[PDB]
């Protein structure tokens, strides 16, 4: 059957419509507004106005032959206190938006919780209250009950780690807390809901169910910190998945995790699929902290992030993972941001972009060529979009975003991705 050549996007990244149609704030919203936690002073408000504009930005994925569209599902549009009270509006957006999708030829590729939080949740104690993990499997069966009729694939989570540790402990993403205890427990609930959201999603029908997962693969001279860093980033969820435990703690005296008996059990459902997100990957030497390890600079060019560019770290996370995973694996989000400026013209030409996705669609490629069971590529982003702590200050788009018009202006790499997916 064919390969899932997608794009990806997320809710609070590309919706805007924060206040509307019945939506709740989530602890993006309240993050947003806090001086320094986001570098442009910007919010989800009016991001990408697609929440209005869906059916262009549809018609944009469609002339590029997308055969399939990542996206996420706003918590609490849904369930604006995140409990309880349904918003039919918000459910109705998705419904009209899945429609939109199959009747363009595009295969819907659903992520449950892409950090957005219902505000009304984080004040009972967030992914820190283990509560939360049982509110997320009701959402989750909310969303499906609705959808499942023609949503081939559900993820629950997006990319747990950034939630935990920028989340909880580094503090640069929403809630904006410091605590490695709360983060341990934000990763251990994220994880409980996953498992509680899996048998949900089952019994309401979820035809393929998964979870997406950012992985750094790691590099150094030194063993030992490479196998911290691992641990540390690529370890720390996917054990877990995989029913081996948590790895052992990447991190110095750790404190506790309420562990209950049998969550395991439950975070180790079967799934039918594992989401591979890959942007750089880390180099290592020993370190010293409450986390060990030193990160060396990029060895190769970077983006604008400085991130390193490093096509073949895809390729060899993709083969790792292959021997590991016993499902199909899909890369749910690769991409990277380049400085793109539009005074008028007709494509934006963002050639560093085009050669960075062009060698990782290669690397991945690859992998498959060589027995990875991969069948599928998405890349972060269809457009430029609110893009979290970076507020509009990185494009990561294949479509350039004018924001003030709300124009969307094809870049090289969107034509060079129409070629890509013609030609496979």
């Given at each position: 059957?064919?390969?899932?050549?997608?794009?990806?996007?997320?809710?609070?990244?590309?919706?805007?419509?924060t206040?509307?149609?019945?939506?709740?704030?989530?602890?993006?919203?309240?993050?947003?507004?806090?001086?320094?936690?986001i570098?442009?002073?910007?919010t989800?408000?009016?991001?990408?106005?697609?929440?209005?504009?869906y059916?262009?930005?549809?018609?944009?994925?469609?002339?590029?032959?997308?055969?399939?569209?990542?996206?996420?599902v706003?918590?609490?549009?849904?369930?604006?206190?995140?409990?309880?009270?349904?918003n039919?509006?918000?459910?109705?957006?998705?419904?009209r938006?899945?429609?939109?999708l199959?009747?363009?030829?595009?295969?819907?590729?659903?992520?449950?919780?892409?950090?957005?939080?219902?505000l009304?949740?984080?004040?009972?104690?967030?992914?820190r209250?283990?509560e939360?993990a049982?509110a997320f499997?009701?959402?989750?069966?909310?969303?499906?009950?609705?959808?499942?009729?023609?949503?081939?694939?559900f993820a629950?989570?997006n990319?747990?780690?950034?939630?935990?540790?920028?989340?909880?402990?580094?503090?640069?993403?929403?809630?904006?807390?410091?605590?490695?205890?709360?983060?341990?427990?934000?990763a251990?609930?994220?994880?409980?809901?996953?498992?509680?959201?899996?048998?949900?999603?089952?019994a309401?029908?979820?035809?393929?169910?998964?979870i997406?997962?950012?992985?750094?693969?790691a590099?150094?001279?030194?063993?030992?910190?490479?196998?911290v860093?691992?641990?540390?980033?690529?370890?720390?969820?996917?054990?877990?998945?995989?029913?081996?435990?948590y790895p052992?703690?990447?991190?110095r005296?750790?404190?506790?995790?309420?562990?209950?008996?049998?969550?395991?059990?439950?975070?180790?459902?079967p799934?039918?699929?594992?989401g591979?997100?890959?942007?750089?990957?880390?180099?290592?030497?020993?370190?010293?902290?409450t986390?060990?390890?030193?990160?060396?600079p990029?060895?190769g060019?970077?983006?604008?992030?400085?991130?390193?560019?490093?096509?073949e770290?895809?390729?060899?996370?993709?083969?790792?993972?292959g021997?590991?995973?016993?499902?199909?694996?899909?890369?749910?989000?690769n991409?990277?941001?380049?400085?793109?400026?539009?005074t008028?013209?007709?494509?934006?030409?963002?050639?560093?972009?085009?050669?960075?996705?062009?060698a990782h669609?290669?690397?991945?490629?690859?992998?498959?060529?060589?027995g990875?069971?991969?069948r599928?590529?998405?890349?972060?982003?269809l457009?430029?979009?609110?893009?979290?702590?970076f507020?509009?200050?990185?494009?990561f788009?294949?479509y350039?975003?004018?924001?003030?018009?709300?124009?969307?202006?094809?870049?090289?790499?969107?034509?060079?991705?129409?070629?890509?997916?013609?030609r496979?």
């Amino acid at each position: 059957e064919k390969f899932l050549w997608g794009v990806a996007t997320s809710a609070y990244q590309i919706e805007g419509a924060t206040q509307e149609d019945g939506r709740g704030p989530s602890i993006w919203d309240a993050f947003a507004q806090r001086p320094g936690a986001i570098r442009d002073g910007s919010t989800g408000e009016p991001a990408c106005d697609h929440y209005r504009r869906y059916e262009e930005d549809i018609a944009l994925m469609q002339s590029l032959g997308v055969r399939a569209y990542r996206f996420s599902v706003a918590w609490p549009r849904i369930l604006p206190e995140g409990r309880g009270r349904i918003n039919p509006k918000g459910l109705a957006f998705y419904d009209r938006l899945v429609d939109r999708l199959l009747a363009s030829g595009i295969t819907p590729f659903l992520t449950l919780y892409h950090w957005d939080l219902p505000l009304a949740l984080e004040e009972r104690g967030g992914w820190r209250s283990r509560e939360t993990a049982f509110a997320f499997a009701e959402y989750a069966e909310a969303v499906a009950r609705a959808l499942a009729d023609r949503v081939p694939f559900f993820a629950t989570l997006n990319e747990p780690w950034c939630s935990a540790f920028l989340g909880h402990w580094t503090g640069e993403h929403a809630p904006g807390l410091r605590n490695l205890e709360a983060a341990l427990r934000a990763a251990h609930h994220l994880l409980l809901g996953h498992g509680l959201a899996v048998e949900a999603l089952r019994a309401a029908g979820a035809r393929r169910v998964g979870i997406v997962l950012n992985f750094a693969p790691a590099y150094g001279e030194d063993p030992e910190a490479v196998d911290v860093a691992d641990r540390y980033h690529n370890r720390f969820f996917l054990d877990p998945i995989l029913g081996k435990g948590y790895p052992e703690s990447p991190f110095r005296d750790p404190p506790p995790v309420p562990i209950l008996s049998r969550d395991l059990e439950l975070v180790a459902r079967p799934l039918d699929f594992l989401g591979v997100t890959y942007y750089a990957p880390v180099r290592v030497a020993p370190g010293t902290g409450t986390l060990p390890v030193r990160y060396l600079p990029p060895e190769g060019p970077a983006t604008a992030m400085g991130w390193e560019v490093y096509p073949e770290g895809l390729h060899h996370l993709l083969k790792r993972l292959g021997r590991e995973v016993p499902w199909p694996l899909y890369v749910t989000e690769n991409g990277a941001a380049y400085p793109d400026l539009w005074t008028g013209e007709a494509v934006v030409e963002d050639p560093e972009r085009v050669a960075y996705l062009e060698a990782h669609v290669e690397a991945a490629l690859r992998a498959r060529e060589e027995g990875v069971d991969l069948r599928g590529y998405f890349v972060w982003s269809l457009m430029d979009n609110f893009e979290w702590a970076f507020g509009y200050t990185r494009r990561f788009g294949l479509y350039y975003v004018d924001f003030p018009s709300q124009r969307r202006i094809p870049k090289r790499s969107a034509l060079w991705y129409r070629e890509r997916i013609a030609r496979a």
